Design an enzyme around this catalytic site. Structure first.
Site, PDB file in Angstrom:
ATOM      1  N   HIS A  61      46.966  18.761 -37.789  1.00 43.59           N
ATOM      2  CA  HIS A  61      46.251  18.305 -38.992  1.00 43.59           C
ATOM      3  C   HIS A  61      44.953  17.585 -38.601  1.00 43.59           C
ATOM      4  CE1 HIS A  61      50.475  19.018 -40.387  1.00 43.59           C
ATOM      5  NE2 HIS A  61      49.725  19.833 -41.085  1.00 43.59           N
ATOM      6  N   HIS A  91      42.990   7.984 -36.661  1.00 42.16           N
ATOM      7  CA  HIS A  91      42.605   9.387 -36.727  1.00 42.16           C
ATOM      8  C   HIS A  91      41.396   9.491 -37.623  1.00 42.16           C
ATOM      9  CE1 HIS A  91      45.158   8.763 -40.220  1.00 42.16           C
ATOM     10  NE2 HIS A  91      44.309   9.586 -40.808  1.00 42.16           N
ATOM     11  N   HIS A  93      39.203  12.309 -40.508  1.00 43.15           N
ATOM     12  CA  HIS A  93      39.072  13.482 -41.345  1.00 43.15           C
ATOM     13  C   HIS A  93      37.606  13.876 -41.303  1.00 43.15           C
ATOM     14  CE1 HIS A  93      43.069  12.636 -43.150  1.00 43.15           C
ATOM     15  NE2 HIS A  93      42.720  11.393 -42.865  1.00 43.15           N
ATOM     16  N   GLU A 103      37.236  11.482 -47.163  1.00 40.75           N
ATOM     17  CA  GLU A 103      38.284  11.536 -48.193  1.00 40.75           C
ATOM     18  C   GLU A 103      37.861  10.654 -49.367  1.00 40.75           C
ATOM     19  OE1 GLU A 103      42.139  11.138 -46.067  1.00 40.75           O
ATOM     20  OE2 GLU A 103      42.046  13.299 -46.489  1.00 40.75           O
ATOM     21  N   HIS A 116      40.420   6.459 -40.120  1.00 36.23           N
ATOM     22  CA  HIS A 116      41.538   5.734 -40.672  1.00 36.23           C
ATOM     23  C   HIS A 116      42.292   5.028 -39.557  1.00 36.23           C
ATOM     24  CE1 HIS A 116      41.713   8.534 -44.385  1.00 36.23           C
ATOM     25  NE2 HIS A 116      40.768   7.582 -44.471  1.00 36.23           N
ATOM     26  N   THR A 195      47.152  10.065 -47.548  1.00 35.18           N
ATOM     27  CA  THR A 195      46.331  11.168 -48.034  1.00 35.18           C
ATOM     28  C   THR A 195      46.803  12.533 -47.542  1.00 35.18           C
ATOM     29  OG1 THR A 195      44.740  11.156 -46.256  1.00 35.18           O
ATOM     30  CG2 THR A 195      44.292   9.670 -48.146  1.00 35.18           C
TER      31      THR A 195
HETATM   32  N1  LIG Z   1      54.709   9.281 -42.866  1.00 32.66           N
HETATM   33  C1  LIG Z   1      54.345   9.971 -41.829  1.00 32.66           C
HETATM   34  N2  LIG Z   1      53.968  11.230 -41.952  1.00 32.66           N
HETATM   35  N3  LIG Z   1      54.415   9.419 -40.592  1.00 32.66           N
HETATM   36  C2  LIG Z   1      53.370   9.283 -39.705  1.00 32.66           C
HETATM   37  N4  LIG Z   1      53.570   9.187 -38.400  1.00 32.66           N
HETATM   38  N5  LIG Z   1      52.159   9.257 -40.270  1.00 32.66           N
HETATM   39  C3  LIG Z   1      51.813   9.784 -41.574  1.00 32.66           C
HETATM   40  C4  LIG Z   1      50.432   9.489 -42.070  1.00 32.66           C
HETATM   41  C5  LIG Z   1      49.759   8.355 -41.674  1.00 32.66           C
HETATM   42  C6  LIG Z   1      48.520   8.082 -42.206  1.00 32.66           C
HETATM   43  C7  LIG Z   1      47.955   8.927 -43.141  1.00 32.66           C
HETATM   44  S1  LIG Z   1      46.391   8.548 -43.868  1.00 32.66           S
HETATM   45  N6  LIG Z   1      45.496   9.851 -43.827  1.00 32.66           N
HETATM   46  O1  LIG Z   1      46.707   8.238 -45.249  1.00 32.66           O
HETATM   47  O2  LIG Z   1      45.826   7.504 -43.046  1.00 32.66           O
HETATM   48  C8  LIG Z   1      48.634  10.072 -43.531  1.00 32.66           C
HETATM   49  C9  LIG Z   1      49.878  10.331 -43.008  1.00 32.66           C
HETATM   50 ZN    ZN Z   2      43.854   9.706 -42.757  1.00 33.09          ZN
END
Ligand code: A1H15
Ligand code: ZN
Ligand code: A1H15
Length: 257
Positions: A61, A91, A93, A103, A116, A195
């Protein structure tokens, strides 16, 4: 099998993750004139001096830079937050073009990318428990615009060739996330969600007003990553952003006038 393609992208997520149509989904458009200054928002505290990065992972992703979160080494406190939130990973986006990729949006403006920094509330013991709580996570969001290089990003850029495809990881020790912050910590905040699936409504979002600038060459390296695994058809990892969701019964607060 969710993703960012035509057949599995954000408009499809609700079929497996019905909370996609929930009351506090993220991201949102930040209407700067409607956000209201909240003079009681108490100072924000980013304490990353003892951060211990461990590894970088292409999860299909995005890529995550992961931290040791078994002690209070890198924590976020203050601002809208009650208690202490530990950094677990960061990470990004990003887009296929410099005109999209973030985002959150600001008065409908997209940025080229968004960072993020993900933190979990220590009162819940573990990340997996925290995501089940309405105040479980705090995500610090930082916009990226293309201009001058960000020197503190280059170590990340340079390892990406080693994690081109889904499931690859590489040791990534001694990375200092303070080199990714802008000068100002002025922010907007609102209650929202992850997100990406599972889209859990567990996040206090803290979105910094001041973007960082990165170079065209830096973002171009992000765009060389792959969504696919090694030995599968190549699909460039670009446009891994969810668009803005309805604000519904929420107010965005500003830390600044
Ligand atoms: N709940 C999970 N999938 N576990 C995990 N390790 N991380 C999931 C995760 C963490 C952060 C975001 S974000 N883009 O909102 O920052 C999305 C998804
Ligand atoms: Zn994110
Ligand atoms: C291809 N579409 N195969 C399966 C598939 C799996 C999950 C999703 S999602 N976006 O609802 O999670 C869509 C489609």
């Amino acid at each position: 099998h969710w993703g960012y393609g035509k057949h599995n992208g954000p408009e499809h997520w609700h079929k497996d993750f019905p909370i996609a149509k929930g009351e506090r989904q993220s991201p949102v458009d930040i209407d700067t004139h409607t956000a209201k200054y909240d003079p009681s928002l108490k100072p924000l505290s980013v304490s990353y001096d003892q951060a211990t990065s461990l590894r970088i992972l292409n999860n299909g992703h995005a890529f995550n830079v992961e931290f040791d979160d078994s002690q209070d080494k890198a924590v976020l406190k203050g601002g809208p937050l009650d208690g202490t939130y530990r950094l677990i990973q960061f990470h990004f986006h990003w887009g296929s073009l410099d005109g999209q990729g973030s985002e959150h949006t600001v008065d409908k403006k997209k940025y080229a990318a968004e960072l993020h920094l993900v933190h979990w509330n220590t009162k819940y013991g573990d990340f997996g428990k925290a995501v089940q709580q309405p105040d479980g996570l705090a995500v610090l969001g930082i916009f990226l615009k293309v201009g001058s290089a960000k020197p503190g990003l280059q170590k990340v850029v340079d390892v990406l060739d080693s994690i081109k495809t889904k499931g690859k990881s590489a040791d990534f020790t001694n990375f200092d996330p303070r080199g990714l912050l802008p000068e100002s910590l002025d922010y907007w905040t609102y209650p929202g969600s992850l997100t990406t699936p599972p889209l859990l409504e567990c996040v206090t979002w803290i979105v910094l007003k001041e973007p960082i600038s990165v170079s065209s060459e830096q973002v171009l390296k992000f765009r060389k990553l792959n969504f696919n695994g090694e030995g599968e058809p190549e699909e460039l990892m670009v446009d891994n952003w969810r668009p803005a969701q309805p604000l519904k019964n929420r107010q965005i607060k500003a830390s600044f006038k």
